[PDB]
Design a protein around this ligand. Structure first.
Ligand SMILES: *[C@@H]1O[C@H](CO)[C@@H](O[C@@H]2O[C@H](CO)[C@@H](O[C@@H]3O[C@H](CO[C@H]4O[C@H](CO)[C@@H](O)[C@H](O[C@H]5O[C@H](CO)[C@@H](O)[C@H](O)[C@@H]5O[C@H]5O[C@H](CO)[C@@H](O)[C@H](O)[C@@H]5O)[C@@H]4O)[C@@H](O)[C@H](O[C@H]4O[C@H](CO)[C@@H](O)[C@H](O)[C@@H]4O[C@H]4O[C@H](CO)[C@@H](O)[C@H](O)[C@@H]4O)[C@@H]3O)[C@H](O)[C@H]2NC(C)=O)[C@H](O)[C@H]1NC(C)=O
Ligand SMILES: Cc1noc(-c2cnc(N[C@@H]3Cc4ccc(Cl)cc4C3)nc2)n1
Ligand SMILES: [Ca+2]
Ligand SMILES: [Ca+2]
Ligand SMILES: [K+]
Ligand code: NA
Ligand SMILES: [Zn+2]
Length: 805
């Protein structure tokens, strides 16, 4: 691509509209494209006399060659050194001023809205805010005076370009398309890398990033990307100069980026003694910006976000696993290596390549194996890492502190490095930072940790923009904001339930089921009638019926111990809701009821499962959504064996489910002072994170229309103040949820030959989920009827229980 570098940057330095080749460029990215005009360094990257005013420069004659000015005309030109008022005019550094609440924007005449400045730092691990506090006074003041989270959760993989582009779009990497720092797109037949020019091609970058959302809605944006050779001081000066533009030309949104502390963290590890200086230098850059804003009378006008992309872990060349120690055929694969693995065939002409044999050769083969293979559809759903053709079918999830590589020579013909990142985004070392400071943010406010996919919505709220469709939950971060909150309405219910009564005689059913239940009292007869009409429903359905947000046919079924929403289309519940008090007792399935399945006289035979299909299907068994172990009485236990409570389960999966139901539910009720459980199936055969329609289901119980779930979920809710029982909670709630994969083996669990007490809870913790994850996968809307604010409930639905110490 040819450039006419003989043009000039005169009057165009850091121009905001980029110009078309062959014309030469003067914008903050021209260096990256080898396209700057011949005089860009001379005019636009001045360095003379450095970055600071000194007493002797005060009131100097302007010399246009100087990097920044200390002349009397510099404030009107907008090009003072950032410490000009401190050195020359007796002013204090911003960091030395007391924190004073910004109740309203205090903006210069002609400012239509508070500008937003995003100050992005690469590799800034969450714990640096505490561990580095003594050397980061400007950042500690933003943090203590503004709104801060103890940490912000990045997206997987915890790499730079996936995370920065998620910050910009509100999208998961599988949706925006930047699924790694390295990628092959088989449709394009094209490779994306950190080095080189392919990564500039727009076809890689999907969604709508914030600078485009702004520009389309009439809000002007600074260019967010900076060529690496532009010094940080010059990036700050360029932002301050843009903020001095005339009102009609001046952007409202800006970004600064620092390559530190990531650059040093790779060399020295996250807490290497060499890491103090990079933290001090980032802090000094924040101080330049804040002093510069104070000079422009913008320090009580601009909203500042201080945010990282990911953290940093200790990783050394010696902690590398080699695929050459597992695979015979190592020359027949291409590996994307490091802190994750992605595997595909080296040649699409090789008809000997078999993913199943590769997976099996990588599965629990060495006792302390430091990675686990997955077909991407079997990855924890909370990673949202499958629905992109750029994500290879075979994935390796690498243990924190480790790498994977194809063969040893890859590690020494490429130890050097002491830090790296990329691992599972629930890993503590990978967590990063969020601070918001300014008029629109709250004052001296802590907020709970949240995910970086939520920030795009908030940045849109700060700018008065309608966000493009994204994976945030708009409103979930309203508690960060003083004003500009977004006040969503609950989605409208699409399908109303049927409330069937007794409509069928037992002999109408030819389901091939049997139950030893022929055992016969007017006291207990009215009572069973009241329980079937919903007399215990306020105990077992604590937060209202889930709303069904798509068109379908389903029945509400009431029972003593549980309530369900029973799909006549999928022949099983969409949800089953029950409450277990701290005092509840566990019981056995009585010997005479081991194989008991009972026709439900409220549901037609034609909308029922049948036991014959399970008998004939030699791979598939069944379980129950409401656990028979937690029946309130022997009489109530018969309800748990209704055919309307049965769901298809592989034997291997029933090991996990029966341990959850028999041991773990009661443990959680004990620990949390009661729990409310909502359980159900999920169908996601196209791994898009969204509810399947019936025509997407790939597997049925043999000989039947009974669809097989890809996953089983549970939502486990209790009172945040555990001095109140789950069923009498006046205040905020506490939730944990999971999305367990419905697999025919426990190959994921290397210790599965051992007692469930040694592996099942570990599996469940890996498959922890947000309620929102379950909403996407089911088309249900939970917590419709609480005493809590809708924004509070949205925050609850985005909560992830991480199980990190
Ligand atoms: C996270 O939030 C995001 C954003 O909301 C959610 O993603 C949305 O999900 C929708 C459902 O999966 C999806 O809607 C589809 O849009 C199709 C048009 O798509 C283009 O236009 C939009 C708007 O500008 C654009 O954003 C799209 O961008 C994608 O594709 C480009 C490359 O083409 C990428 O650069 C970009 O990164 C992005 O890729 C991602 O999404 C695509 C799917 O669009 C994936 O395949 C990628 O892997 C990656 O994840 C596009 O440029 C529209 O055509 C669809 O409608 C079809 O389906 C319905 C089914 O009923 C049918 O009625 C229609 O007739 C049509 O069917 C016909 O085509 C079928 C497929 O060829 C065919 O099989 C049939 O037989 C028919 O011929 C559909 O509406 C929307 O695009 C995305 N948007 C984004 C940004 O990803 C996401 O779900 C959220 N995640 C969670 C878990 O909640
Ligand atoms: C070489 C090289 N490798 O990386 C970079 C680089 C990375 N990032 C930026 N700017 C970021 C992009 C972004 C996205 C979203 C938000 Cl909210 C803020 C920001 C600022 N500039 C350059 N140059
Ligand atoms: Ca990074
Ligand atoms: Ca799906
Ligand atoms: K069977
Ligand atoms: Na196993
Ligand atoms: Zn890095």
């Amino acid at each position: 691509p040819w450039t006419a570098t003989s043009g000039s940057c005169k009057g165009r330095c850091f121009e905001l509209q980029e110009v078309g080749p062959p014309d030469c460029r003067c914008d903050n990215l021209c260096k990256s494209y080898s396209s700057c005009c011949h005089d860009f360094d001379e005019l636009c990257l001045k360095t003379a006399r450095g970055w600071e005013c000194t007493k002797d420069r005060c009131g100097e004659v302007r010399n246009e060659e100087n990097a920044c000015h200390c002349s009397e005309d510099c404030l009107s030109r907008g090009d003072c050194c950032t410490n000009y008022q401190v050195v020359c005019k007796g002013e204090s550094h911003w960091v030395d001023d007391d924190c004073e609440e910004i109740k309203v924007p205090e903006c210069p005449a002609g400012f239509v809205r508070p500008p937003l400045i995003i100050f992005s730092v690469d590799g800034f691990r969450a714990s640096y805010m505490k561990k580095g506090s003594k050397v980061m006074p400007n950042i500690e003041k933003l943090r203590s005076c503004g709104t801060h989270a103890p940490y912000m959760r990045p997206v997987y993989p915890t790499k730079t370009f996936p995370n920065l582009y998620t910050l910009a779009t509100g999208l998961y990497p599988e949706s925006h398309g930047i699924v790694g720092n390295s990628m092959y797109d088989p449709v394009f037949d094209a490779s994306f890398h950190l080095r080189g020019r392919e990564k500039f091609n727009h076809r890689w970058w999907g969604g709508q990033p914030l600078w485009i959302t702004a520009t389309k809605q009439g809000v002007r944006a600074g260019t967010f990307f900076w060529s690496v050779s532009i010094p940080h001081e010059r990036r700050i000066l360029t932002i301050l100069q843009w903020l001095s533009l005339p009102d009609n030309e001046r952007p409202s949104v800006y970004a600064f980026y620092s390559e530190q502390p990531d650059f040093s963290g790779h060399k020295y590890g996250p807490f290497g003694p060499e890491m103090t200086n990079p933290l001090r230098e980032i802090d000094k850059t924040v101080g330049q910006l804040m002093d510069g804003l104070k000079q422009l009378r913008l320090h009580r006008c601009v909203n500042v976000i201080f945010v990282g992309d990911h953290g940093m872990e200790d990783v050394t060349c010696d902690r590398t696993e080699f695929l050459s120690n597992y695979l015979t055929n190592v020359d027949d694969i291409t590996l994307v290596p490091g802190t994750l693995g992605r595997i595909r065939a080296k040649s699409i002409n090789n008809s000997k390549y078999d993913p199943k044999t590769i997976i099996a050769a990588l599965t629990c083969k060495k006792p302390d194996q430091h990675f686990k293979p997955y077909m991407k559809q079997h990855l924890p759903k909370r990673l949202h890492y499958a629905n992109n053709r750029r994500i290879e079918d075979i994935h390796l999830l690498v243990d924190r502190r480790w790498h994977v590589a194809r063969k040893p020579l890859d590690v020494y013909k490429k130890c050097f490095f002491q830090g790296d990142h990329g691992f599972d985004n629930k890993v503590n070392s990978m967590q990063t930072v969020f601070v918001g400071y300014g008029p629109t943010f709250k004052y001296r406010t802590k907020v709970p940790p949240f995910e970086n996919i939520e920030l795009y919505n908030v940045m849109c709220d700060l700018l008065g923009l309608k966000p493009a469709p994204n994976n945030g939950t708009h409103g979930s971060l309203n508690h960060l904001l003083r004003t500009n909150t977004f006040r969503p309405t609950m989605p409208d219910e699409v399908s109303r339930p049927n409330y069937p009564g007794i409509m069928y005689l037992q002999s109408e059913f030819d389901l091939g089921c049997t139950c030893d239940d022929k055992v016969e009292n007017k006291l207990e007869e009215l009572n069973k009638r009241l329980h079937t009409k919903g007399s215990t429903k306020e105990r077992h359905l604590l937060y209202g019926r889930p709303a069904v947000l798509y068109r379908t046919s389903y029945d509400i079924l009431y029972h003593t111990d549980f309530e369900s929403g029973y799909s006549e289309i999928f022949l099983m519940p969409l949800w089953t809701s029950y409450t277990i008090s701290k005092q509840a007792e566990v019981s056995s399935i009585p010997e005479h009821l081991t194989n008991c399945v009972r026709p439900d006289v409220r549901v037609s035979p034609g909308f029922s499962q049948n036991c014959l299909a399970y008998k004939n299907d030699k791979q598939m068994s069944y379980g129950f959504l409401f656990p028979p172990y937690l029946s309130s009485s022997p009489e109530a236990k018969y309800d748990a064996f209704l055919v309307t409570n049965m769901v298809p389960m592989y034997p291997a999966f029933k090991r996990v489910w029966a341990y959850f139901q028999r041991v773990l539910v009661k443990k959680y009720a004990s620990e949390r002072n009661g729990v409310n459980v909502i359980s159900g199936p999920i169908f996601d055969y196209n791994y898009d994170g969204l509810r399947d329609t019936e025509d997407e289901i790939k597997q049925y119980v043999e000989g039947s229309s009974i669809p097989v779930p890809t996953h089983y979920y549970s939502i486990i809710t209790s009172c945040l103040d555990f001095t109140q029982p789950a069923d009498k909670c006046d205040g905020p709630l506490s939730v944990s949820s999971f999305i367990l994969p419905h697999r025919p083996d426990n190959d994921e669990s290397c210790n599965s030959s051992e007692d469930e007490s040694k592996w099942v809870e570990e599996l469940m913790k890996m498959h922890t989920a947000r309620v929102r994850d379950i909403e996407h996968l089911t088309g249900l809307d939970f917590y419709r009827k609480t005493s809590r604010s809708y924004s509070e409930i949205l925050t609850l639905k985005t909560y992830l229980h991480t199980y990190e110490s």
